[PDB]
Every structure is written in structure tokens, then in C-alpha cells.
Paper text:
The very first step of this initiation process is accomplished by DNA association with the Origin Recognition Complex (ORC), a six-subunit protein that forms a partial ring around origin DNA. The complex consists of six subunits (ORC1-6), with subunits ORC1-5 forming a partial ring capable of encircling DNA. All five subunits contain a winged-helix domain (WHD) and a AAA+ domain which consists of the RecA-fold and lid domains, although the ORC2 and ORC3 RecA-folds have diverged slightly and do not contain a lid domain. Adjacent ORC subunits associate in a double-layer arrangement through interfaces between the WHDs in one layer and the AAA+ domains in another with ATP-binding sites sandwiched between the ORC1·4, ORC4·5, and ORC5·3 AAA+ interfaces.
The first of these, ORCO2WH, consists of a dynamic ORC1 AAA+ domain that is unresolved in the refined map. Interestingly, in this structure, the ORC2 WHD was stably bound inside the ring-shaped core of ORC in a conformation that is similar to the auto-inhibited state observed in the DmORC structure. Only in the ORCO2WH structure was an ATP absent at the ORC1·4 site due to the displacement of the ORC1 AAA+-domain and consequential disruption of the ATP binding site. In contrast, in the ORCO2WH structure, the ORC1 AAA+ rotates ~90° from a position proximal to the ORC4 AAA+ domain where it completes the major ATP binding site in the ORCO1AAA structure, to a position proximal to the ORC1 and ORC5 WHDs, disrupting the ORC1·4 ATP binding site. The latter position resembles the auto-inhibited state observed in the DmORC structure. A minor ORC2 WHD conformation was observed in further 3D classifications of the ORCO2WH particles. In fact, this conformation resembles the completely collapsed ORC2 WHD conformations in the ORCO2-5 structure where the domain is further tucked into the core of the complex compared to the auto-inhibited state. Notably, this alternative conformation does not resemble any of the conformations of ORC2 WHD in any previously reported structures of the various ORCs. Overall, the ORCO1AAA and ORCO2WH populations reveal a dynamic switch between the ORC1 AAA+ and ORC2 WHD where the locking into position of one domain within the ORC ring-shaped core kicks the other domain into a dynamic state.
Residue numbers in the entry:
A (entry chain A): 761 to 860
B (entry chain D): 17 to 142, 152 to 431
C (entry chain C): 3 to 87, 94 to 159, 177 to 193, 212 to 501, 549 to 618, 625 to 638, 644 to 661, 673 to 709
D (entry chain E): 5 to 85, 92 to 330, 348 to 433
E (entry chain B): 268 to 574
Write the structure that this text describes.
Amino acid sequence: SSYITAIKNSSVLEQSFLRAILAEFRRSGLEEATFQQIYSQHVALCRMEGLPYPTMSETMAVCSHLGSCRLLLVEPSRNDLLLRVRLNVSQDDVLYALKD
Amino acid sequence: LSQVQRILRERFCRQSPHSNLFGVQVQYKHLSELLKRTALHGESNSVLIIGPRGSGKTMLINHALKELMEIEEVSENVLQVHLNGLLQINDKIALKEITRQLNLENVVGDKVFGSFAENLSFLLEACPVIFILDEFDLFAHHKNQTLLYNLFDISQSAQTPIAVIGLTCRLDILELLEKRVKSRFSHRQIHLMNSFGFPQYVKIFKEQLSLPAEFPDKVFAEKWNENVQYLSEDRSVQEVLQKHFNISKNLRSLHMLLMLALNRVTASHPFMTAVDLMEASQLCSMDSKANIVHGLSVLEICLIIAMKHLNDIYEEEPFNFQMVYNEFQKFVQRKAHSVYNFEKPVVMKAFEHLQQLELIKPMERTSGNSQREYQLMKLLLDNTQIMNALQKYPNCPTDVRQWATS
Amino acid sequence: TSSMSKGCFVFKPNSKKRKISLPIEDYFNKGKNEPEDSKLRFETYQLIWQQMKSENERLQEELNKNLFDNLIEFLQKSHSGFQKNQIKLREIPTAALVLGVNVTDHDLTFGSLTEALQNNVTPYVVSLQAKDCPDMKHFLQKLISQLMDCCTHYSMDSLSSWYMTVTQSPPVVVILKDMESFATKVLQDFIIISSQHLHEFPLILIFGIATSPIIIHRLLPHAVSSLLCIELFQSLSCKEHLTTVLDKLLLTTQFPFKINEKVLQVLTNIFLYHDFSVQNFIKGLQLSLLEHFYSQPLSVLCCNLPEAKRRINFLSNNQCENIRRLPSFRRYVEKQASEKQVALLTNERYLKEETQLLLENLHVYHMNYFLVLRCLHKFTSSLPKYPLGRQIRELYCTCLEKNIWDSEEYASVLQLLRMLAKDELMTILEKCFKVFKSYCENHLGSTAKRIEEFLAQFFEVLRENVVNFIDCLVREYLLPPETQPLHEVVYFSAAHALREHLNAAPRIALHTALNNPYYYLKNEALKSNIAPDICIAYKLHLINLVDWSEAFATVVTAAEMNEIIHARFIRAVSELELLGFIKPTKQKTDHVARLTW
Amino acid sequence: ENVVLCRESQVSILQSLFGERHHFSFPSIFIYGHTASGKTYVTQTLLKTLELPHVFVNCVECFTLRLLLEQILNKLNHLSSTEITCETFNDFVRLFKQVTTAENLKDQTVYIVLDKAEYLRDMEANLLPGFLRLQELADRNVTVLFLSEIVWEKFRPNTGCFEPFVLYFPDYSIGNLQKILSHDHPPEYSADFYAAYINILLGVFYTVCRDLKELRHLAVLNFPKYCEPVVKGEASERDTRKLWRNIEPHLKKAMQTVYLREISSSQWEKLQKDDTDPGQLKGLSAHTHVELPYYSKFILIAAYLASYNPARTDKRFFLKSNHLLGPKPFPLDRLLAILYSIVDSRVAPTANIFSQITSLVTLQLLTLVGHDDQLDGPKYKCTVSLDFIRAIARTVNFDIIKYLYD
Amino acid sequence: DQQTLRNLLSKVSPSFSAELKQLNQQYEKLFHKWMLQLHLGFNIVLYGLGSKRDLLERFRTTMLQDSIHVVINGFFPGISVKSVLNSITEEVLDHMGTFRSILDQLDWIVNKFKEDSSLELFLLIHNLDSQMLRGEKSQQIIGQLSSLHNIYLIASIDHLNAPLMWDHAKQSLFNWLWYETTTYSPYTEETSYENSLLVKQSGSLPLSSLTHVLRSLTPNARGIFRLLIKYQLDNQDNPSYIGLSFQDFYQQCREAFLVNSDLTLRAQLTEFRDHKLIRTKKGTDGVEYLLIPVDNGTLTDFLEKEE
Ligand SMILES: Nc1ncnc2c1ncn2[C@@H]1O[C@H](COP(=O)(O)OP(=O)(O)OP(=O)(O)O)[C@@H](O)[C@H]1O
Ligand SMILES: Nc1ncnc2c1ncn2[C@@H]1O[C@H](COP(=O)(O)OP(=O)(O)OP(=O)(O)O)[C@@H](O)[C@H]1O
Ligand SMILES: [Mg+2]
Ligand SMILES: [Mg+2]
């Protein structure tokens, strides 16, 4: 499908962002998240991977890039650190696309 | 030199055409086949190009329509109509533009046509026509998608050859369209995804930062090209290109970085250097909220440390001015004596300034229902941003900093 | 006609071209007593009411002059900066006009202010209100409408274009009448837009503030409150306007109509306790005037004394016997001599002379009463402890209800007055002697040359003499008006009807009607089960609806296959929700007792 | 006349990106900065100095889309050289291409500065992506500048946009503030004297204020008081310590009154002129006493007891976790029960009493929550402080503090 | 019982008939006083226990005959101050046009009464305290009307908390004189019987009942319904192609942050089936409607009034 190959041809930090979303959803057991918990997991994943420390205005750029397409639908950017982030595609599809 | 600046500034600032295409040959072969199919024969077609922002969808249609226009006995008979979502928001304005670009504003006269399709039928009856619909999803949010339905219905049914190309950056573009217009839509999708690795990114770097072969000052041109070869093979240039590659694989950001590094070049300093790309990468990677919190007064920083303790103790619970003022009072007694011992109105003025910058947000939005105090608000700074900003806060009194650690 | 599935029925007298309507006089006379009397009383009413209205509107113009002098001084000071000025970051001059709590009389207070400005500072003064400016577009639309009236996507540049068209020098003055009610957004946007372009559009704002000036802080933030140069102003007090209008309407002898003590208590209570609105007092006086000239036929004699006696001279027989059966005249003949008893009743020509004599006696009683009242107020205000009252109207009420020296209150003011300093007494008799100066045509000139003699003396024996002088004066001339014959011609005493028309209590009426149906239905309906259905249901609920239904069924069957009693329960419960007693909840079929009384 | 100080790097970067007239610059630059950092001043002086055709538009004045477009197009038609009207964005683009083709404006970068641009995100949705892509849509060598106090990420539309170059105008430190405030020295007195005055003023007011305009205004106001010792002759130019000891207590009084705008500037300069000391003027504050009717007073001090006291305790106080959280809403029946309880005399439920209950709300002394079922209207709140109610209760001889809490 | 069955059982007669027959001519005596106080600049409000409709209608028959008078039904569910402005503007005055706003039409009619005094209008309101005329904007428009000298107004209030409607600014406009008329007639006209415990409910919901059921509900639920109200509004313009779909509704309501899961939307559409709000025509071969049966004009007038 379009969404799976779109996830596969995306950059490194967008894929790490989608992994933060998956792990945070596993922690929460819910389909929505405040952006704060996603960023707090994304910092830990960037530390584990070896990537440098991501600033808030880069993570917001990545999140708004994913929300500009429909891999993810989020609230207007007006509200910050207070967004509701939900996946638009199924979690198993995300794991299939990122496993490669 | 001035001419090098002029050519490369038209390459970077304006999105002016350059000759080569990076990894989009198959997609262009499909697109050019369908445009020559529409123009040469009488077949009517529809295409829905899908790709992220800055991935050259307009590059593909401009170069394809240019080579289509180059073909003999096509140029005299083919008419184009460029319509855009951000300009035309309602279908009557779209109708006005379709009359105006076809140069039939004199022909159409004062007659008011009974139905939209009758107006389009009169327009097209006075020779193929091509309809480039930029921002297709903005057309999709019309009242009942009337223009899209009429365009797809005329392309399917009428004899008059028509190509309807649409451009979107949404992967749910075939879920917004209502059930009749999907049925009228032939499902031809050309996906222009950025499928290129890091050595290909470095190749695009060196291809885009090089002069053309019709440049007059040839002797300067070859040494400029050898300089950009050495720059592309440099280590630190590779490091900043890797840092930009990890964020996105979009060529627009690369053209912004190259424009900044190009703009540093002056008459005295005539060749690019690794430090131009390093400093131009430093300019792009700034953190905005740290720059704002650097600008604050000392008292507003004391208020922010009080808010951070409030969110630390009573976790995920909103606050008003009275709790933050009480915690600040515990500060002005507990650490120091007769220093920072301000009255309530100046503290309220600082808190209202913090609200002006939108570093705090009113949780419930009403119309004058609440007074200035007792109004529940939330902090829009994470704890680690506050620690990083206090870390390099110019001359932050050891007292406030020691409060902040504990 | 009025019952159809639509909500507007308009009846016109069309196809019948007789549009002549009844003159208002025809509505005044609904009876057959005396129509010429009932048409002349309506002219007398209109005359007296126009006089009181004109006197009040002149008085309010006179009172607030002092505030306008300072305010015109401030607006003459402020515009000198524009005369020098090249904005140089000049602020917008504003005046916070702290008005009172009352809202009704403010429409007078601004209007005179408007005229004052149009005479002195500017010819361009416009007033805006919060009710008709919801957003910036409507705000600027009405701004450029009133500015163009004083002399299409309107913008501030279009205002400056009009200004440079008309001037080719004075400021423009915007009065915000109701500061409390404005939206916050239009105030901040108007201040920020106007502040940038004031160097070609001079702007002076007056804020009409009902409460304390802290409201300026509440609506306007500190980033916007620093763009104004603010100066505070305080207006009249409501109490002072009340005492002034009472002194110039009731206590003056110029107007023939008066009001009783209980009517005055009602109008003073609905002011002091509920709202400090003098315009409601003027409404109450107009209503008392209308009921007094509508009820009493012989109130045609309530005029100025020349017209009063020429109206006495020509009367009908029925008006003469109405005079003959007045209770004040009926007790007057009883204390009169035995020959004069038959002399008054048998002959109408003797009666026409006697009523003229009695009315002239009543008028000079009023003149003496009010003059001695002002002098007693001078003694009352001079004393520190303020026993009878602080003001003129409290003293007038307490003397009007009963004799002061009959009450034991007056011994206290005597004993406080008797021990006093010489200089204080010199000031007191100076004040009293300029009261005797103040009212000409005195019938107490002997007291005027007496108080000239005691002032000319200027110890404790003559202090006792002057205190006994005012003591004999206050026994002599202040008496309640009920002890004067023919007093019901110029007095109105209907307290309860006035109280019901002005200050109603529509909850007490419903509660009394439901708890006691016997007051309005005197057919033996209650002493401490036979009632209208609404009463029957109302008594029972004071709450599940089926138990209430069977209780109502039991009661009404005790009162007498019946399906109708359940239908009566449906109607009764439905019409109880229209009066606000039943509210549907979810715990039971229903459970609510929101009346709670 | 027009000097820019401590902004050398920032004006260098703008002059670099503008480049030459024939060259094409960025379609949009987004300048953001903390308050009083010289955004408007530096940009206006730079644009006026280089003699570039440019338009300055404030978005606060243009609360309508038509007003904004009309203002831009009319100012450009005056720069070219009666009245042109444009309702929609498309008509703006057509007429913009029409006015741009004048001989003076064919080949030069035309700037459209948009100051206070955070009010562009509350207007029509197509306006802000339309302006960011104006060089792409119109193709007329146009550059737009957005000046704002708000960081860029808040502006981002949901569907994305042509991302601009984000620039940061940094704050002034203590040295930059001192060498911008002392620059306009008074001609009568010594420059070092005025510099020491700026040194003590910045020494007092740095903690609560880092705004250039407010500090410049406070330096203007307090300067005749500073030089009164040298005028009286008790101290000289070089007796710095005596002057600082004189003005050091007065600066605190100027911080607590003028800085909060309690006492206006004219009354303040009158106080220094006529030698009347400050502290004898009440100011706009401390006038918190309003003369109210008797029943409205008791309604107000009954609604304050209804709002700020729990319903569970209502039995104990009247029939026989703090104030910090705020006012709790109450129903109207509680207001009538408390009102009937506290008043010693009999109260009848007349029309005037309900008119008073619905009047306090209009006078912003009370406030209804819900805004639903106005006739029933049970919900109400109390918006006044402890001191106002305590004063009113003292007037009618009622002990409010016994009833508030144990 | 039924509301129609309530209409059929009208057999009952009042017990105290002769006793209540003297309470009508007693109030009929005061008619000349009421008319005179109308001409002198006062207005009359009637407060009582029974229905004042018959008294006001007798007042129309006896006195206000040779005048251009207007009768207004507050008790009618489909009434608004916009309608009374139209009724003043189009037939009483000979204007035939459309006005931009209610305030712009109110200022036109106010100005029309300013330049001419030959017009006199009598404006009766049978209930001034009904739900449609409860708004502060509504009473502000009526207060702007009644304060002129060429127009007169008699109104009656029934609710126990009617004095909350008027404050000191608004009761300055109305020169009220409060007259008690405590007749004992039953509320046969003003009791609609709709949303009562009579189980029978007739036709589409009136706007008052639609608002009353919709206010005591989750704000997210008000949004979810507004979506279909606005959709059905833009779809109903021709009878062709009418009908929403449930997967399409899940798409539209997931785009917005209203519903989290499909089971939540199913639970929501059953809650709308509970109050007879939604008509589920799912399983229809053409399209799975999920439409609303409420009239379209009522839906527009609800959405404009909702906030
Ligand atoms: N694969 C590619 N081949 C050639 N040029 C490219 C490619 N990808 C990006 N570019 C360059 O990057 C820019 C892409 O932006 P362009 O205006 O062509 O379309 P776009 O921005 O994707 O369209 P939209 O604005 O609708 O997103 C152009 O300057 C183009 O020259
Ligand atoms: N270097 C300087 N030299 C002299 N004056 C300066 C300097 N910098 C700023 N100013 C003053 O600052 C004012 C302009 O400040 P500006 O409006 O740019 O602040 P701002 O941050 O835009 O404010 P806001 O927060 O209202 O947007 C001018 O009046 C100017 O006199
Ligand atoms: Mg494009
Ligand atoms: Mg500025």
C-alpha cells in the first residue's frame, strides 16, 4: 500500500518518532497521546541509537511533517506540547514497514 | 562574482528549472506518455500525483508540459488552464478563471447560464484542453465537490479531449472524494516519494552547487567546479550533510542551506569553505523556545521555577496565580532576606508578560467569565528545556539556581 | 383569529376609511359624575406635570456644573501637546468619569456634558454604547457614522481622511457610556489602532465607569493600559441629588400638589433600600399625581390661589355637595358655632366664601410650616449628635408623621441645644437670619425683627431665651396637615396601591393564591378538600409521579369508572411546570422540590 | 538621526540576503524576537537607507482580509507613481501582477513588510500560505517579511506550507542597554554625569524590567529629580555618591507607582516640580469602595458566602482545599436562603430584588456561569476580593470572618 | 395517556363557576385605566395564576378596534424576535425587502417611527416569558421598540422567576406598571403537552424540544450531531443523492478529535436512537442514510442559536 512504502522511504528521525509512538502506546495502552510523553520516549531512543540530542523545534518539525501527510493526524500547531497524537495507520503495518 | 551569485540565487531562491532529474525517470515516463497520449490522440485522462512537500511535483509537470509543448503541431492547438486551491476557494471564482485563461471572456458575454455544466459545455465548444489542478485536496473541501464532478464527468463523457492532473501531499486523497467522483475518476497515481540514499544526497549536493556549461567566464568556471568537488569530499561538509539528512530528505531545505552558505561568499572571499556550511548549519538548527527564555527578566525566571515545582509536586494539575505566588513567597522568605521581596502588582505584571509570549496557556477559554486571578493555566515548557535554559542563563544569581536544582 | 400555527397576527382598519380616533380626554372620564370637571382636571394635571419636569431638568443642569468646569479644564490642557506636535510616542488622553451605581439617570448626566463640550472645547463629540458595538467593524462603522453626522469598509485611514477634509484643529471626543459592558477585544484593538495614528487624528476618551476604577485594570491589560494618560474624576452623589430635588419639588410652596407621609415613606424606602435612582422617584411622583387627579373630583380646586378661588366661584351643585360631605369640613362645622352650622349647610353661597377663606388659611399654613422647617433644620444641622436626622428630608418625614414635641425625641435636642457656645449661637442665628432673608413676602416679620434683636445682642440667660424662642416657634407653627381643614384637596394618601403598582411581589401572589383559594373565591372554600385542581396538587407535593397520581385520585374521589381524574392530574402537573415548580429528573419517575418553601 | 547600535551582525545578515536589486531573494523571511529588541526600527531604518521600494503594513489595523489587500495594493500604486478595489486573494494576485509591471518596478525586489503578523493566523486560512508562496504564485520578484514576538512553530498550518528562513533578533544585555540609553545625552549637562545616572537606574530596575521603551521613559521622568542637588548647589558633578544616595530611595517609589501606572506621568512630574512628595496621591488603585444600596450590599455579601464556602458546612453556620483554588459556583436558591438568613428584618421576594440580582451581574460585580436557561438561571459566581466584601460587611455591621471559616 | 387523548377529554366543567364569573368583569372595569396609562407613556405587565389570554383578547375586542394593532404569541414554539421585526416591517409598514441584520432592521423601523407621528401601533404579547423570547438580545430589541412614544405594549408573565429578566438598565426602557389579574382559567392554549409524560409525541421535534433534549448532553456529542446537521443541510438542497454513510461518518469524526473508536460512535448513534433523534436507514441498497427527520429550517435556526 501507499502508507507502508511511504514509511519505508522516510528519514531516520521520522522512523524513530514512529517507534517512540509505538513504545509509548504500549506503555499507555491507549490510542491517543499528549506530545510530551512521545518526546520523552524519543529522547531515550535517540540516546540509545547514538543519534544526537533532539531539540524541541526539530521534533515539532518532524511531527508536523508526518501530520502534513496522513501517516499521522494531529491537532493544530497553535497548541504546543499539548497536542493529541494518534496513529492513522495500524500498528502491525508500522511494525511490518519498520522491520525491514 | 556577480554572475555566479545571480545564477545560483535563481537556482536556490526561486524554484527555477534545472536540467537534471534525480531518481524520477520512471514516473516522468508515465506522465509524459499520458500527456502525449492526450495531446496527440483524442483520449481524455486523469492523474493524481501524490508526494510530500518539496518533492518536485511542479518540477515534473513543468518539465513534462514543456517537452510536450516542444513537440511540433502541438503548440498551436493545445491550451492550458492553471487553477490553484489557495487562490480559488469557491467554484464561481474557479469558473471566472476558466473563462479568463481560455480567452473567452469576450465570447461568453453577459449571458448567465442555468447550470454549471452548461456553462462548461459552452466554454469548451469554442482543440484539446489541459487542466492542471494544483492543491487538489483544497478543491476536495468544497460544498459538494461540484467542479471536480463536472471536470471528471466531462473528461469521461464528452468528445472534447481533456487531461485533469491533480497534485496532493495527502495519502488519504482517495478517501476525501465522495463516492460518485471516485467512480468517475480513473485510478492513475504517480507517487513521487524521496527514495534516495545518502551518497545520492551528496551527489545532488555537488550537482546543485556547480555552475552550468554556458557560463561565459570559463576559466573561473572549471576551478569553481574543482572547488565544489573538494568541498563535497570534505569530512565536515559530510557531517553537516548527514545532520541535515537525518531530519529530512527534502531538497528545499538543502537549497536553503546552500543559499545561506552561498550568501556568505563575497568579493574578498571568493570560494566556499567548510566553515560556511558549518555556520549556515548552526543558523538553521536554533532552538526557538530557549532563545525566548534567554530573553526573559530575572523575576519571570523565578516565576517559571515556581511553576516547575508546582507541576513537580501536583503532577498534571493546572494552576492559577495564587499558588505560584505562594510558592514564590516561600522562595522570598526561605532562601533570601529583603532581596526579591516584591509586591503583588509587579509579580502580576510579570505573569501577564509570560502570558503575552504564550509560554503559558489558559486551559479554558471563555469571554470575560473569569477575573485575572483564580484562572487555571498550563505551562508550555518541559523540565529539560528549563534546565538547559538556566544552564547558560547569563549571570543567574546562585540563589535562584540553587532553588532550581532543589 | 389569535389561534393559528404562526406567531404574528396584524389587524388593520383597512376597507374602512374612518381613521378618526378618540381624544385622550374621552379615556379620562369613564363615569357619569361630572364630565366638565373631568375634562378640566386633565388640563390641570398636564400643567403641573410640565412644571415639575422643567424644574427638575433645570436643576440637574445647575447641579453638575462644577465637575464640567474641571473636565473642560483638563481637555483644554491635554490638546496643547497635539498643538505642539512627529507622534513622539504621545499617549491617548483619557478621563475616568466615576459615575454612580444607578444606571437610569446616567443618560441625563452625559447629555448636559455633551452640550458643555459643544459650547466650549470641540464641535465634534460622539457617544458610543456597548450594546451596538459587538466587533471592530460595527464599532468603526458607528464611529464614522456619528462623526459624519456631527459635521463601506471604513478604516482608521478613512477617519483621518475625513478629519483632514473637514479641518484643513479641534479634537474629537469619544464618550464610552457603559465601560463595564464592552467586549475586551474591541477595547484593546481600538486603543492599539488609534494610538499609532493619533498624530493626524487627535483622540480624547472619557470612560463612563459605574463601579470603582479597578475595572480599568480588569478589562485592559498592562501592555495596553500604559498607552493612556489617565486622570480620575468623581461625579455627584445620589443622596445629594435626592435631597436637592425634594427641596425644590415638594417643600417649595410653588407647586400646589403635595404627598402624604406614608407615600413619602414608600418612595424613600424603594430608593434607600433597592436602587439610588432619582428617576424612579420622579416616576412615583408622576403616578401619585395621576391617581390623585383621576380619583378625586374636587381636586380641580388644587391650583394656585387666584385660579383656585375663581374656580371655587363657578361650580356645579354636585361639586358643592362633594365639598359639603368632605370629612375635614364635616368636623369643621362640628367645632363651629351653632348658627354657623346651619349657615354653612343650607346656603351654598356662604359655602363658596368659606372654602376660599379655608384654602387661603391652608396656603399660609404651608408657607409658615416650610419657613419654620428650614430654621429648625439650621438648628438641627448645627448640633453635633444629629438626633432627628442629618438631612432635611428625614426631619420633614419625622415632623410630618407626628408632633415632635409630643414625642420624647425633642427633649434630647432641646437639652443638647441648651448647653452651647456663644460663637456657635452667633453662627446659628446668622444662618437663620439669612434663611429669613432667603424667602421674601414673610408672614413672620415679627420673628424677623426679633431674631434681628437677638443677633444684635451679639449670657446663659439670653441663651435660654433664644432656645425658648425657637421652642415656642416650633410649637407654634409646625403641625401635621391632617389637623388643617380642606386638606384632602392638595394631599394624596394611597400608600398600598402605589406600593403594589411600583414594587410588586409576584411570588407572594402565587403562593397565597395556591395555599389559600378562599381570598379570591369567597364561597366557603377554606377555613384551615374542595378547591381548584392546582391547589389540590400543590398541597400534596409539598416525589414520584405515580404515588402523587394515586394520592390525587384518592383525594378527589373523597371529594366526590373514572378516567377523568387521571386526565386532570396530567393537566395539573403540566401547568405546574409552566409556573416553575416541577423539573424532570432521572432518579425516580420524578423527584424535585425546587420551590423549597 | 537614524543610528542602529549593537545590531551590527543582524543588519549585516539582512543586507546580505537582500543582495542586489536584480538578484532574487528568499520568498519570505520570518523575524522573531523578544519585546523591545528593535525589529520595526532596524528593519525600517535599513529599508529607508538602501532606497528599496517597500511597503509597511500593520495587521492589527487590518482586521479584515479586504482591508489588508487594499492597503498593500494602494501603497504599491503610490510607490509606482486612483483607487483600485480587490475583494478576494485572486484579485490581489491579478492586480498585483498589474501594478508590478511599471517601469520603476519591473526589475527590483519589491518588499512587503507585515508587522505584528500573529494576527494573520486568526484570519482566513488561505491568506498565510498564500503570502508565504507569493513569489511562486505571482512570479514578480517579491519578498515578504513577517515580524512577530511568537516562535514559528505555532504559526504552522495543518497542511504544511513553504517553510521560511527563521531569524532571531537577540535581546539587549546590560551593556547594550547602557550604551543605547546614554547615547541621547542632554546638551546642558555632562555626558559622564548622564552615564552614571543610567548606571544607577539600570542598577535598580534590571530585575523587574528588560524593556528598552519602559526604561527610557523612566529615565526621562526621574532625571530632574536627579540633578536637583547640583541645581541647589549642595553637590557637584563629580560627587556621584551624594547624588546616588539622594535618588536611591526615590527610585523604589517610582518602581511601585509609575512603573505600575498607578499615578500618571503628568501627576508625577507635577510632584517633582512643585516639591510635593510622592505617597500622598492615591492613584488609580486604593479607591476600592463603592456606595451601594442596602439590599444589594446584603445580596453581595451573601453571594460571597455562597461562593467561597462548602455546602456541607452551610447547615452549621446559618441554620443554627482553601480560598486558593477560587470561587465555587452556587445555585440561586442558596443565595436566597443565605440572604433571608443573614438579614435581620423580613425580606419579601419583590421584583426589585430579582432585578438587583440580575443587575450586579451587568455591573461585572457578579457573573453567571453556564449561560443557559436565563429565567431559571441558578448558577452564579462572586468575582470580588476579600477586602471589598470585608469593607461592605463592616459598613452594614456584619462579621464576615466568623462565617467564612473556623 | 396521549396528547390527542388529552384533547378528546374536555368533558369537565369548573366547580366554582358562578364564583369565578365575577372575576372577569371586575378586571374588565380597569380597561379604561389601562388604556389611559398606555397613552401617558406607561406599559402594563400582568402577573397572575390563571390564563390571561381571554382577558387580553377581550381587551382587543372592546377597546383596540380602530387602530393598527399587532398580536404576538409567545406560547407558539416557532416564534422569534426576527419574526416580530418582519411583522412590523413588511405589512404594517409598506416595505418589501430583505435586511442584513436584526439590528439594522430594528434601526430602520425605529427611524421610521421617528420621522412621522401619524403612525400608532399597539403591540400585544400574550407571554413575554416564553423560551423563545427569553434571550437578553430579544428583550433588548423589544425594549428598544417599546420606549418610543408612538408604540404601546401590554404583556403578561406567568413564570415565578420572571423579574430576573430585567435589570435597572432594561426596566428603565419598559415603564412597567404591575397589575395583578389572578383569574383561575386553565392553561389550555399554552400547555402544548409536548415532551410531557404523555407518551404520544407528534411529528418532528419543535425547536424548543430539540434544544431542551440537546443541552443536557456531552459537548463532544453536540459536536458529533452538528457535523450531520451541517452535512444534512448541505445535502438536502436537492432530494437527489441524499444520505450519509457510517464509514464516511467514522472518517469525518476521526479527522476531528471527537471520537476515539468505532464502538464509541456506535454507542453514540444508539444514544441518538434513544431520544428519537437519528433515523437509521442502514441496510438500504442505495446508501446507508443515518439521516435526521427534523425539518431543515428548524435545524438552521437551532445551529444559529446554539451558541
Ligand atoms: N527529484 C528531483 N529532481 C529535480 N529537482 C528536484 C527533485 N526534488 C526536488 N527538486 C528541487 O526541489 C524543489 C522542489 O519543489 P517544486 O516547486 O519543484 O515542487 P514542490 O515544492 O514539491 O510542490 P509543492 O509546493 O506543491 O509541494 C525544486 O526547486 C526542484 O528543483
Ligand atoms: N539600537 C537602538 N537605538 C535606538 N533606539 C532603539 C534601538 N533599538 C530599539 N530602539 C527603540 O525601540 C523602538 C522600536 O522597538 P520595536 O517596536 O522594534 O520593539 P518590538 O520588539 O517590535 O516591540 P513589540 O514587542 O511591541 O513587538 C523604537 O522606538 C526605537 O526608538
Ligand atoms: Mg506545487
Ligand atoms: Mg515593534
